């Protein structure tokens, strides 16, 4: 099958910038490439077909070019509505195959997270489980690392996290990490700490509590 290598996998850009996304095929596809845009929870929409033909109704700021094995999609002057994920697709030979996508987000200033730790409630303790939650609020850019330590022992395998999409008012993210323990294990240790590593931080921050 033809492999389509799309780049970059993600990028932050400001309004007004010229954005170029590339796609390289493992063999010559003779311009039989299409480009698509998809927004969270919505269907992809076709932007370009046969490498450089604009779909009726798509704004003229979108254009594609290339031939042989190398192609690119260019947005001449970025607009807020262009945020989302873009995919290339070759339909030169079966099976038709897609690039792995490019996530386009809005660039803003670095901002470190405010971190908070929350111990399990006694109400939950009753049930027989303890969830310890760590919150990293309003940070940028996305990349961040959370490490759980119980009485200094590092936890792995027993935590899950989720993150919000960029905020419409301030373009930052928020994230939560939940550490799950048996009521028993929880009762066995003392010191519960959440260490957060992020660009915005000159040094790794720790929030902890006892019992």
């Amino acid at each position: 099958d033809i492999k389509m290598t799309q780049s970059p996998s993600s990028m932050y850009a400001s309004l007004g910038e010229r954005v170029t996304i590339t796609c390289k095929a493992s063999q010559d596809i003779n311009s039989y490439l299409s480009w698509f845009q998809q927004k969270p929870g919505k269907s992809p929409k076709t932007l370009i077909y046969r490498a450089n033909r604009l779909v009726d109704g798509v704004p003229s700021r979108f254009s594609g070019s290339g031939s042989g094995q190398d192609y690119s999609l260019t947005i001449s002057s970025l607009e807020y509505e262009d945020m989302g994920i873009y995919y290339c697709l070759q339909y030169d030979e079966f099976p038709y195959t897609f690039g792995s996508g490019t996530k386009l987000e809005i660039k803003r200033t670095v901002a470190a997270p405010s971190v908070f730790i929350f111990p399990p409630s006694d109400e939950q303790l009753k049930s027989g489980t303890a969830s310890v939650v760590c919150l990293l609020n309003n940070f940028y850019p996305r990349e961040a690392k959370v490490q759980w330590k119980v009485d200094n022992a590092l936890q792995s395998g027993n935590s899950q996290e989720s993150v919000t999409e960029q905020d419409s008012k301030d373009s930052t993210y928020s994230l939560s990490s939940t550490l799950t323990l048996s009521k028993a294990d929880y009762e066995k240790h003392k010191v519960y700490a959440c260490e957060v590593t992020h660009q915005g931080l000159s040094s790794p921050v720790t929030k902890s509590f006892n019992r």
């Binding site: 033909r53 099976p95 908070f116 939950q124 939650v133």
Partner: protein, 221 residues
């Protein structure tokens, strides 16, 4: 006004087969190929295959040959994809799309997508626990609090704060699927540390599938 109409969400047991449809309107169904595409989280888009209505010719991506089967009903202008031997690996949003007709193609018309979830779990309303402000503090300028909505199935649950009057600073996180097969979700909100006594903070949780509705007051200590 060329359009694509897909069937509604499906919840299936692992091992079962499901058949989704796509009703094409506003054009002559028989000359165009109908494309089928798979979209699961963390895996971009994948091409399953295409079928031409009338002659019924079809083309399958080797990856899905035994698993997907297409058919098209000429009279009702409807096309179908049956997915068999389902696994969690098959939970995804599936799209159908109108591609090309003999030498021609000026772009696609995508259906709205069909959500397929494959799980053995039974319907179950969640437990809501408080995420109480300030570990061993009360005075720190701005404080965070929230609610942990744990162990429900299936999606989704909705969460509001103070019946809707509290919107600023509210972040409700995407649900996560736990090993138990149940979902968990958190909602937080930061407030001026000087409300934590002059104000009530209740998170309104609703899980329609189980006709569950909970209001939880969250607070210090």
């Amino acid at each position: 006004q060329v359009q694509l109409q897909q069937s509604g969400a499906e919840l299936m047991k692992p091992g079962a087969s499901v058949k989704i449809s796509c009703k094409a309107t506003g054009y002559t169904f028989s000359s165009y190929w109908i494309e089928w595409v798979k979209q699961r989280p963390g895996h971009g888009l994948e091409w399953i295959g295409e079928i031409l209505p009338g002659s019924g010719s079809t083309n399958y991506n080797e990856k899905f040959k035994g698993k997907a089967t297409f058919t098209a009903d000429t009279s009702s202008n409807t096309a179908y994809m049956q997915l068999s031997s389902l696994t969690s690996e098959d939970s995804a949003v599936y799209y159908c799309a109108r591609g090309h007709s003999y030498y021609f193609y000026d772009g696609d018309y995508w259906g709205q997508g069909t959500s397929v979830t494959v799980s053995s779990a039974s319907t179950k309303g969640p437990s809501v626990f408080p995420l109480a402000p300030s570990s061993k503090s009360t005075s720190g300028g701005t404080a965070a609090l929230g609610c942990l909505v744990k162990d429900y199935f299936p999606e989704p649950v909705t969460v509001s704060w103070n019946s809707g009057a509290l919107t600023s600073g509210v972040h409700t996180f995407p649900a996560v699927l736990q090993s138990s097969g149940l979902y968990s979700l958190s909602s937080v909100v930061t407030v001026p540390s000087s409300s934590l006594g002059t104000q009530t903070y209740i998170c309104n949780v609703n899980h329609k599938p189980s006709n569950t509705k909970v209001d939880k007051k969250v607070e210090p200590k």
